[PDB]
Amino acid sequence: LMAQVFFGPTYYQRLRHMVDDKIHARARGPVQVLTRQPVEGRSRDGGLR
Amino acid sequence: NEDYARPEWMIITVLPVPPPQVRPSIAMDETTQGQDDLTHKLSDILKANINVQKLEM
RNA sequence: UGUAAUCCCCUUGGCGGUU
């Protein structure tokens, strides 16, 4: 490489936010009883606002 | 407006009772459903109406 | 011929993530 590279060990930490705990998709599913709109929440297979 | 908004209609003499779709009940657990807030308020209103009718006669 | 099952609160409060 034409440019030299800064290089060495550094302390890194893994945070709790992982993509597989955030990915969510919905085509159709449960709806609220009062308004008949998609429910809220990824855990409940809800929709996006 | 004579046809649509008559002044004496601002005093309630008959109350419309909404269908259960407006005040749905919720199953709090596997055995007991809770009445909605509107259902309880309508029950209180009807009890007061019955009380007034009984007292008057 | 023995023929397999379809359904989910609400309110509240807190803690957070991205700006």
B-facing residues of A in 7-26 (CB < 8 A) are none
B28 CA to C12 C1', in Å?
14
Question: In Å, what resolution does this model reach?
Answer: 3.9
Structural contact between residues A39 and A47, judged by C-beta atoms closer than 8 angstroms: yes
Residues from chain A contacting residue B26 (CB–CB below 8 Å):
33
> Among B39, B49, B35, B34, which Cα is nearest to B17's?
B39
Residue keyed to tokens 């034409």: A2
Method by which this entry was solved: cryo-EM
Report how far residue B13's alpha carbon sits from residue B55's, in angstroms, rounded to the nearest whole number.
18
